[PDB]
Write a protein that binds this ligand. Sequence first.
Ligand SMILES: O=c1[nH]cnc2c1ncn2[C@@H]1O[C@H](COP(=O)(O)O)[C@@H](O)[C@H]1O
Ligand SMILES: O=c1[nH]cnc2c1ncn2[C@@H]1O[C@H](COP(=O)(O)O)[C@@H](O)[C@H]1O
Lengths: 225, 225
Amino acid sequence: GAMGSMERASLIQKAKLAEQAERYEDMAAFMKGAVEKGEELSCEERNLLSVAYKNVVGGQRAAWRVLSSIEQKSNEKGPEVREYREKVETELQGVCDTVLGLLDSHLIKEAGDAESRVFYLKMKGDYYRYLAEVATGDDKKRIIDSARSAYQEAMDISKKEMPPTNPIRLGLALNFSVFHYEIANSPEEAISLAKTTFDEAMADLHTKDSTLIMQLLRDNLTLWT
Amino acid sequence: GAMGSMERASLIQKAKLAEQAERYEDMAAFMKGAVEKGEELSCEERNLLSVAYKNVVGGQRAAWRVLSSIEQKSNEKGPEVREYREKVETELQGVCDTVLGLLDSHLIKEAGDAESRVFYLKMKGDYYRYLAEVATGDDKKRIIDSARSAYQEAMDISKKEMPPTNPIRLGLALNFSVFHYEIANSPEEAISLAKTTFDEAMADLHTKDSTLIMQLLRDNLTLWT
Ligand SMILES: O=c1[nH]cnc2c1ncn2[C@@H]1O[C@H](COP(=O)(O)O)[C@@H](O)[C@H]1O
Ligand SMILES: O=c1[nH]cnc2c1ncn2[C@@H]1O[C@H](COP(=O)(O)O)[C@@H](O)[C@H]1O
């Protein structure tokens, strides 16, 4: 595709240039580029992937929210705001469906360092979650099953082979739980895991940046309870 | 074109939605849309035009600068950074050439309230200036003539029919002078006008937001002298 002709290492250098210039569209395009090569990504590369995708989909989800909100106070008048809301909703689904293709097509295989098999399964759950935040109907149904399947296979792996301070295991559990509350409408399952996790981490805290996740991880229990 | 089928007032409402959502690409697209209708813009509309275009071209010029800088420290190694720099340079020229089409094609006619005939001529000078910041050769030559022609016809009009507190006349002169220093390499002409203008404004200051322009207008003389 659009980067087919470019050397993998150049794609990677240009991702980094993009990041410096604050051009996440670019950065994501370059990374989709490298990924599409077929070489397994290093830890440092994967951080470029997620970071870029996250900022892109991030601003979309912002605008979506601004707009749904205006479409709430527009229920007490014109289609203009529903129309535009749908526009942004459609771009977002776009990016999600793209990132979800990378994971299904290249990144996830059932053969890898495993500490990152997680990173991907997690990423799969988050992007499927982002689709859930905007879907309706049976669409919303299936997407929910999917964020569950992934986030769960990522839990198994993270428990079995990851110490409970691993900012991966932390972040993952955090996410999976936000999903439990915000999406699947199951605050029992949500509170349990939010507690348990922050438990078994406050435990080995003796071994200092996972603490930021832990700040949030509890920060969430405030409102949940 | 892409908004041809949409009612002018809807375009305008959606610009405003865009602004709330912080989607300047959208906002600019919608406005190019309304402008393309053929109806003269009100003051409030024009502010949506400029604001949207400004933020778009604004982030481009940022990235350009980040990148040229990395391409400076890259002169003491790979084409990756020149290549990407050129990419961004080309998007920018794009947007400039678009905005410059709106002015030449719709917005500027030699028949209007005139206090805004200025607003456009000024806008023409700034976008031509933005092209100058990145051009070379005879290209750079012609573009400079063009930012001059415009900014000047905008000076005549602004002197003749505008009191020297008019945030338009202020801003204009400010810009025209930055051009004199930063682009046309003529600090004599630059210092003169920067002085003169801030003079005849400090004069009638007795008649309180143009002061922000005046803050800058002097702020510039610091470095210029
Ligand atoms: O850097 C991060 N990594 C993982 N989760 C985060 C991060 N920053 C914030 N969060 C959490 O994610 C929530 C928003 O959901 P998300 O951004 O869709 O994953 C926030 O309310 C936090 O609980
Ligand atoms: O809101 C504004 N209107 C007009 N000129 C501005 C504004 N903000 C900053 N400037 C000036 O414009 C310079 C940057 O050039 P410009 O952004 O290409 O017009 C700044 O250094 C200021 O002198």
